[PDB]
Design a protein around this nucleic acid. Sequence first.
DNA 1: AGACGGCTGGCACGACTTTTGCAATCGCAGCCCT
DNA 2: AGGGCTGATCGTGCAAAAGTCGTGCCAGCCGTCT
Lengths: 255, 259, 255, 198, 50, 50, 413
Amino acid sequence: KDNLLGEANSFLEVLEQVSHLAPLDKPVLIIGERGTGKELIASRLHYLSSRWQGPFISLNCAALNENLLDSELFGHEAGAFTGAQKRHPGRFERADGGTLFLDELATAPMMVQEKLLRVIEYGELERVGGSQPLQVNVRLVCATNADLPAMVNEGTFRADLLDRLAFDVVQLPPLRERESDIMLMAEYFAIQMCREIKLPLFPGFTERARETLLNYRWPGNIRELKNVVERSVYRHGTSDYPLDDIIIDPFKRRP
Amino acid sequence: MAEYKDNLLGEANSFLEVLEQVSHLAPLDKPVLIIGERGTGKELIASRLHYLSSRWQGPFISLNCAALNENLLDSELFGHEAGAFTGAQKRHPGRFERADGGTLFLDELATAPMMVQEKLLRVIEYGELERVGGSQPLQVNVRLVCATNADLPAMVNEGTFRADLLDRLAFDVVQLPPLRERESDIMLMAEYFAIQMCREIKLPLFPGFTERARETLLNYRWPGNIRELKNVVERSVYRHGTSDYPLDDIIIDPFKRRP
Amino acid sequence: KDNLLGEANSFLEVLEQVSHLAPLDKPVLIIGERGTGKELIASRLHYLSSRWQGPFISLNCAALNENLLDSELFGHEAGAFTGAQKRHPGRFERADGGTLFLDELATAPMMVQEKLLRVIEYGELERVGGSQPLQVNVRLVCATNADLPAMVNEGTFRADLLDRLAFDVVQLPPLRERESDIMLMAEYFAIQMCREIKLPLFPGFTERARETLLNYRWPGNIRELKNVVERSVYRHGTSDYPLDDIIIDPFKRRP
Amino acid sequence: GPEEITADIPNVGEAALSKLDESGIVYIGAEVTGGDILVGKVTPKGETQLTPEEKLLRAIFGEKASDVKDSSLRVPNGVSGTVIDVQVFTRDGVEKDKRALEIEEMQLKQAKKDLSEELQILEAGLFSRIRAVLVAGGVEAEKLDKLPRDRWLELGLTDEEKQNQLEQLAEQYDELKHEFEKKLEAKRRKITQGDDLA
Amino acid sequence: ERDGLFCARIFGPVKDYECLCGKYKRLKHRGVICEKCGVEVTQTKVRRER
Amino acid sequence: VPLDGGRFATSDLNDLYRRVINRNNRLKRLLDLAAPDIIVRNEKRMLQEA
Amino acid sequence: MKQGLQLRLAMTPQLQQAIRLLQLSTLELQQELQQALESNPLLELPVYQGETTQTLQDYLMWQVELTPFTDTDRAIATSIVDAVDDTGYLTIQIEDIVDSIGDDEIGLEEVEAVLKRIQRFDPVGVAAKDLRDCLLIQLSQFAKETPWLEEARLIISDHLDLLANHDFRTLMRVTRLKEEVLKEAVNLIQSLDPRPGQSIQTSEPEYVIPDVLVRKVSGRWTVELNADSIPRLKINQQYAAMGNSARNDADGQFIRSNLQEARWLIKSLESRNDTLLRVSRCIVEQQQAFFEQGEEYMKPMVLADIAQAVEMHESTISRVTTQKYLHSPRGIFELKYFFSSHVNTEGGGEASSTAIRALVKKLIAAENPAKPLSDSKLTSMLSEQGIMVARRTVAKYRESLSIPPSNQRKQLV
DNA sequence: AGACGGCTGGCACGACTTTTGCAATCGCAGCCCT
DNA sequence: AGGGCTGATCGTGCAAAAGTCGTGCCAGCCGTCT
């Protein structure tokens, strides 16, 4: 409950959908532009979820090691291997009732897709040589920049992985897609960043550069705008600098 | 005795006859092979069989070839008694050793390890199991059950499936109907899913399935037999609706991004 | 010695050659059709070998794991590593004079080929950091469905892997091949299926369907015929069903 | 173990049990001379080991085992005379009703005879109303006297006013029968509500 | 109670001539003092008189 | 004087002089440990009172 | 990383002793704490009421004193009476009393004469002494005019062994008399002053201090630790405040060492209490079937896995698990009593040797008193339960139950 | 009237419990020896 | 003026050998009916 969402028509509809689906512990899908921070809305929903007082631990799918994927999704029972002690619940078993936002879900491999399909079922967690699997119910959350239907058509993701998704795939509109309250939200973010960096304000201010960059691609739908604003503020290094000669082009070399 | 299936997610056209034939083969403990859509009509069939499974107290231990990693798979498969293979400790009850006399519930994971398939060929050869570093092999008994999703002959001709794996297996074939083919209990299953959603979500009443919704579902390819319909119904219920419109503008397909 | 062998000219010659080489403990290859029951015939000949009263332990060639190649082909001396106690002889060392029946050798890896070449040496059981190797003599037998010459031409089979077997390769005829005791084996299989299905007998009996299926490839030379016979017996659902409208086609969608 | 009144007093004279009813308590109205025992409660007593001496005692006499301390009610000294009646109250969760069922039965008999009499009057009023509605219209009182027959079941003394009156009175009689049954049920529940001790 | 209120080996004799521990459990035993506990195995008048 | 039998309900016979004696034994142990003179004096304040 | 892994302290003396005291019992730990506090310098209506033979002992002596007897005769009677067990028979015979006295004046003859004079005084058959002659004394005191009195006397004299098996037919054959001819005599012998006072003689009171009390609060029985029976370790804060100001380093160091030892001991006791509570909760969860249904529904319940999964291991918990009791609706149950045998499995099996004994008792009860039922029937019941007892593997269970069957003891109908 | 038979109790061994018996090395530095 | 070395303070586990049950299983016997 802290993201600098524009609260525009699309933003308000997305927030309403997230709040409505917050009580539901069923798995949900997040579509749209990554790098923009749809995960922040996921954390907000998880806080607003029914398991609000539950240990929510998200995970990056690409983070798990291939040969340690089993140790990632579970815990070594220590009845095997050279490793001792262990008997430590897996990240999902560590949460066991909270929200596990699947990060880098599109980065999941075919083996990872199959492991997720195995996890599409409820609980049944058996450790290394476990006597009996353990069932633990936890709410599920996933995000993916790439198109899950596109991956399935490519066959990169397993079919059950798509079938693992149950709730609506919330798609994030790009920077140009909404562009209704992005000016206000970016201004608020810039004000907060200036306060944090002991910068009072920008006396020059102005939005002619902002109005022009409204007709800009901004591939990083939300993060890129803030990064470019910070770069412009730092490079200008002055407050009484209006939105003139300020464009989103930090990599660009001056002439 | 008679154990009712938890769900009866089947097709009126011929899945009733399929269940009848399954009950006919229910008494036998030989290799029972099911087939159908993966993720949809498959493990629902497995649960129905477990309800129709012979006797009781049988460990319906289910294993998926995706798990158990790669190197650790063999130890959990054959078990482990000697040290340095299971860290010494107790003689590790392997995944196969976990279910003695129970159903060996298979999932159509298609383990790319031909070594896994070769291990499984010896798994059902004479009913025996030897632990890792085990000085003595042990003859074990258990039931077998599986569900399928791909043409085992097509893979075998392609070499993807070992000829010996299908030779030892595939005693009898039980293919679940594809969703685009049955088209019979579609209304029945849709009504059951809608009622279940209304009950769980505490909805005052089922909004109802409009003719446009039924027509779209019939036109829908629905690659998944028993789950894709379930997921679509869940998405439509999530989209929600007033009491006024029974199913007007219902979002069954959540993959469609909004404007 | 429980297999209902066809005793065909092929089957009888196979049994006779098996008995002739039953006293000899040299490596040999049981060639022909796998899935058809080479393991049962292997057990019968082991009971029929020179050391009939011996501990015979067979296993799948590719059953074990790659990292545990030493732990499977030998015993953990436990001097090094996290392994404790152990000092347990391998399954081959568990036989200690028995028949190491090679099964599923077609799936063996290059490391497995190297281990087999090491096994071509006379005994020489050296553990990890063991004092000295132990030479242990046991009977050897091999069975596979693929042409080891074909693999060696592909280079998959090592030269020593090809030379691992010390006798001429004895081939098992296919169902489309032997086709001799097809009526007798069919009748025995039908009797067994009826007994298992609690059916006293099939009043229809007859072999017109059996004769038609005789003019079929039946790739699973014994496996396919038995599975198909059991399937037809179950599908008929009535004893008074002659060998008509019965065929081997489990996969085909019935009209 | 609770002290249960079953006249199963260990080492009890036969005459002592000869007075107690099977309920541990005695019959009613019975006269007691001297310190007579009326209600024999069996307070549990402590147990012991194999005690082969006591094993032989059980093999010989048995049935005592020193397990039930006698909580029997014996008449007080200088107290002897007629027992007019008794009262037994059992806490909720205990309803042996060995003679409590009989007492509640007598009480409910009186209670129902009360409820019937009012119900009897109501039913008689309805029946006479039906007979009058059918009277003077070919349904002779002799027809109604021989069988209530719902006064020949709307014989047609008027067949419209008689018929409508019969329908209304039938509805009323059904309601009254339902009400009387409900009242009897409530009274039976109250009588069966039992006692509730500490 | 061991060395408690009205303890053995103290405050006079026991209820019976049998000792609390059990050693020297007889009314005939007069001078025999139980080794387990040194208390009077005699009449209990001394219990008040001790 | 156990009225209900379950509880002794010592009719003014439960001697805290037993607790005082326990405190005196603690004082004796501390004296064996040679406790501070303040503790000794306060030990008397309680033990000597008995 | 890969399917590979790796492997990863040492203490002794003081902590070892601290853990050792935790392995002890409740009252034993209370006594140990009381003794330890005796040395710790920094840690924090004459004769009640009763009746003649209130605990079954003085009525006989009062009756003897109510009769003329000499000082030696009174002493012999007192030796007989005071040495009478809770069963009413003379716990110590004349020889034991004479040996304890060591006096030749109180001889066997004098003690025997005193006992015979007090053989039936108040009540009949006092100081009975392995009561076989006391039954005969009761029969003789009973009027000889009773029917079959000669038959009863003959049975009581030396036919006790025959009637011990309750083989009335075999007893009659041995006595060369018709079966049930002395049935009135046998019944009278049964009703023959057993232990004289018997239950009145049995003044055996009840004492119990279970280490826990299972209230079974709304099922899933709520195990409440006996906090009253659980001592509270109090450290003398006065010594703490009187030691810090001590300029003498010796006194300050002694006080600091005492405080550290008290802290370690309190930690050990608190850990013992907490582990006992956790293990009791686990046992209650495992054997609610035993708690409610009874001994028949007994499955093994020794703490494992769950204790290890929670913290440390079952090691030293097996040590501290000793001597823990619980008062429940089923009764008083011990810690080792909570753990049972394994039948369905090697460990934690559904049935138990206690369940075997309970089923054996039920089956032997479910038979005619003449002949108890075959253990093969209870064996078949166990096989239905999955234990697969069989008649031979039941011998041990029957011996544990010690129920006398027909072959062990044949009673005549 | 000696053998069936279930008892029973001894006899046996693996599987689960247990309990007991295990803590150096400092690292200050100053004083004392060299 | 430089080396020695001085004892402080240093803590919740487990495991290793033993025991010990649980279950089963043999051996005889007495109640007995033959």
